[PDB]
Amino acid sequence: IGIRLTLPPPKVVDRWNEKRAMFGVYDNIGILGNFEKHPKELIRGPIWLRGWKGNELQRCIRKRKMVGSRMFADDLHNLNKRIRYLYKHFNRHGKFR
Amino acid sequence: ILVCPPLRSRAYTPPEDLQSRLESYVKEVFGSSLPSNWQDISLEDSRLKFNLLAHLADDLGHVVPNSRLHQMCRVRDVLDFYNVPIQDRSKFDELSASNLPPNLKITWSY
Amino acid sequence: PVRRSEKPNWDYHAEIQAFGHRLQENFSLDLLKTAFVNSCYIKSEEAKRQQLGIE
Amino acid sequence: TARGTPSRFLASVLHNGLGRYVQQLQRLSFSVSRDGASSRGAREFVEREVIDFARRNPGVVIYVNSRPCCVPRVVAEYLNGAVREESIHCKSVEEISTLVQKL
Amino acid sequence: EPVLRKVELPVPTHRRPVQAWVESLRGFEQERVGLADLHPDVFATAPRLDILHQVAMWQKNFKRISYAKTKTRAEVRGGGRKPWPQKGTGRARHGSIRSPLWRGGGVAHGPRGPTSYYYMLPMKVRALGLKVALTVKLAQDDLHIMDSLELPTGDPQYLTELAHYRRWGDSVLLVDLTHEEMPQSIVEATSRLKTFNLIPAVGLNVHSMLKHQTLVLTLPTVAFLEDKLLWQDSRYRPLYPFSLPYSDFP
Numbered sequence: 001i002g003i004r005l006t007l008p009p010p011k012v013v014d015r016w017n018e019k020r021a022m023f024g025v026y027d028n029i030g031i032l033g034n035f036e037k038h039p040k041e042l043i044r045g046p047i048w049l050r051g052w053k054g055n056e057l058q059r060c061i062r063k064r065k066m067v068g069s070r071m072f073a074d075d076l077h078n079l080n081k082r083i084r085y086l087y088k089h090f091n092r093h094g095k096f097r
Numbered sequence: 098i099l100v101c102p103p104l105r106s107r108a109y110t111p112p113e114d115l116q117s118r119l120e121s122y123v124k125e126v127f128g129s130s131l132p133s134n135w136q137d138i139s140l141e142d143s144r145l146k147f148n149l150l151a152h153l154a155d156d157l158g159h160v161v162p163n164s165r166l167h168q169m170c171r172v173r174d175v176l177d178f179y180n181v182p183i184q185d186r187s188k189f190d191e192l193s194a195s196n197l198p199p200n201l202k203i204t205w206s207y
Numbered sequence: 208p209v210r211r212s213e214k215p216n217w218d219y220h221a222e223i224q225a226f227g228h229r230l231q232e233n234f235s236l237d238l239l240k241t242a243f244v245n246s247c248y249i250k251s252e253e254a255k256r257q258q259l260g261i262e
Numbered sequence: 263t264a265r266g267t268p269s270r271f272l273a274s275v276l277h278n279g280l281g282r283y284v285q286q287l288q289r290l291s292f293s294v295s296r297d298g299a300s301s302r303g304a305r306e307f308v309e310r311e312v313i314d315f316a317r318r319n320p321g322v323v324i325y326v327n328s329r330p331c332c333v334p335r336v337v338a339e340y341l342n343g344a345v346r347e348e349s350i351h352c353k354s355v356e357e358i359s360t361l362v363q364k365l
Numbered sequence: 366e367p368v369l370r371k372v373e374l375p376v377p378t379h380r381r382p383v384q385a386w387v388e389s390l391r392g393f394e395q396e397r398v399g400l401a402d403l404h405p406d407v408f409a410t411a412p413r414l415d416i417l418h419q420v421a422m423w424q425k426n427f428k429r430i431s432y433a434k435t436k437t438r439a440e441v442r443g444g445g446r447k448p449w450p451q452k453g454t455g456r457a458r459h460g461s462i463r464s465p466l467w468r469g470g471g472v473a474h475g476p477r478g479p480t481s482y483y484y485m486l487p488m489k490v491r492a493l494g495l496k497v498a499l500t501v502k503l504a505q506d507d508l509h510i511m512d513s514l515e516l517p518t519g520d521p522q523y524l525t526e527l528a529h530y531r532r533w534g535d536s537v538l539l540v541d542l543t544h545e546e547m548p549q550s551i552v553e554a555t556s557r558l559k560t561f562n563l564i565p566a567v568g569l570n571v572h573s574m575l576k577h578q579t580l581v582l583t584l585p586t587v588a589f590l591e592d593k594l595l596w597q598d599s600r601y602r603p604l605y606p607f608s609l610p611y612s613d614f615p
């Protein structure tokens with residue numbers, strides 16, 4: 001049997017949050033703040049992909065270039081093997097060549 | 098200190114002396130003559146338009162909305178607006194006040 | 208099982224009127240409402256109002 | 263399949279067309295929502311067509327409950343006692359009119 | 366005396382301006398203290414809900430970075446040698462544990478790394494979305510334009526009772542400009558309310574305008590909006606980004 005016997009506790013969500021109410025504020029800052037900032041300078045994330053979409057191979061290459069001088073050892077080796085595998089995949093296997 | 102003047106109904110019924118009242122307040126606001134077509138003069142002058150619509154909204158209680166504030170170019174247009182009338186009963190109050198048959202009952206759990 | 212009078216969607220006057228109408232007949236509704244009561248129901252309702260003592 | 267479901271013989275309920283024809287429908291119990299997009303077709307049905315439907319065949323008693331529900335329904339009760347409950351969840355006005363006419 | 370606000374930008378030869386009432390917040394029923402007209406290219410564009418959907422979904426998804434990650438079959442711990450050699454026993458051929466078939470294996474096609482979803486619309490599309498959303502807020506009788514946000518008291522019950530009396534809505538987005546001339550009364554009022562919001566005019570956006578029921582602008586705000594949004598019409602190619610000098614552009 002997979003199904004649960006009792007229905008779950010009620011998940012109550014506050015739609016008038018602090019974060020939900022001011023979502024999208026200081027977006028659209030460049031257009032009507034005479035272009036002092038870009039809207040991509042509002043992004044808060046990893047230091048390599050802040051305003052950059054990328055592939056899986058391209059994300060790994062960019063992370064190795066911008067950060068891989070200060071990564072941990074096992075994480076750096078795993079990133080090396082991932083870039084090797086993804087090069088072998090994208091440039092040799094698949095349909096549509 | 099200034100708390101709670103009561104809410105006002107949105108319903109409206111235009112009175113029967115609407116023509117005399119409009120001509121009286123146009124004579125009062127514009128300070129001009131009748132000559133031939135009082136209901137064809139324009140309201141591009143925004144001070145005169147504001148004085149007319151503010152005086153009417155003070156008197157009759159209904160006020161022109163913004164989407165209809167756009168479309169008033171003549172006094173014929175505000176005369177055609179003040180013959181519209183609307184009604185602010187609920188849906189259930191309007192439904193039970195229709196000619197319901199003897200075999201249709203409705204209830205409201207709200 | 209319970210009577211249909213005790214389930215939620217129920218109105219007596221509309222049911223008597225529809226009972227008159229679906230048989231394609233014209234009953235005078237007072238005589239039909241007279242016909243649907245019973246002597247046992249009368250005695251039981253007065254027994255219920257007297258065990259509680261309500262006039 | 264026919265071996266897996268029950269079966270009955272073709273029958274009238276109480277010899278309808280012999281004497282007088284009687285409408286075999288007793289009730290229609292409607293439960294629609296005030297707010298909620300799933301009950302929009304039923305909301306418009308209660309607006310425009312249930313009054314003419316009630317005037318059309320007066321043997322039927324119609325109830326509209328107007329209850330908060332994620333799926334609106336119609337319960338059709340017949341003379342022999344059977345109860346048929348159908349969902350009018352996200353349907354047109356024409357589909358609901360077809361459904362209550364077939365019921 | 367009445368407050369009249371004529372548009373200072375040049376209108377086209379046809380296409381006369383659209384108007385709106387000027388309310389205030391000092392009194393309790395002080396609506397209709399003046400009458401303003403607005404630029405029809407900003408407040409009367411075509412309704413265009415496709416552009417609303419484009420800018421709304423861009424605004425929701427361009428900031429998103431999802432930090433989901435699972436371990437592939439090369440990162441799960443262990444799994445080196447070949448268990449039960451290829452031809453001897455009668456089990457199924459396997460070359461490593463932690464292959465994705467096994468319990469405790471790595472995922473075959475799972476999420477990979479912190480993935481970004483960044484893309485930018487052309488700026489004319491975003492400005493067109495703002496003009497479209499202002500027009501949609503006007504035509505459905507939702508927009509209200511004030512002379513100055515100033516309450517007499519500065520307590521939130523006054524603000525919510527006034528918004529109830531004027532039949533605005535359950536939520537309302539209040540806009541002032543420049544974030545420093547916001548007076549103390551409205552700030553101390555709406556700093557506690559949960560559905561009423563103050564933003565500077567730089568932070569106007571399609572998502573907050575759709576999320577809140579009405580939208581309350583100011584007369585310096587509507588002049589600012591007309592200038593910044595009409596500048597996209599009649600503008601050249603960039604030639605370098607507009608933060609650089611450009612003799613006309615401040």
Ligand SMILES: [Mg+2]
Nearest residue numbers: 439443444445
């Ligand atoms: Mg390994």
Ligand SMILES: [Mg+2]
Nearest residue numbers: 447459460461
């Ligand atoms: Mg192998």
Ligand SMILES: [Mg+2]
Nearest residue numbers: 441469470471
């Ligand atoms: Mg695992």
Ligand SMILES: [Mg+2]
Nearest residue numbers: 442468469470
């Ligand atoms: Mg384990």
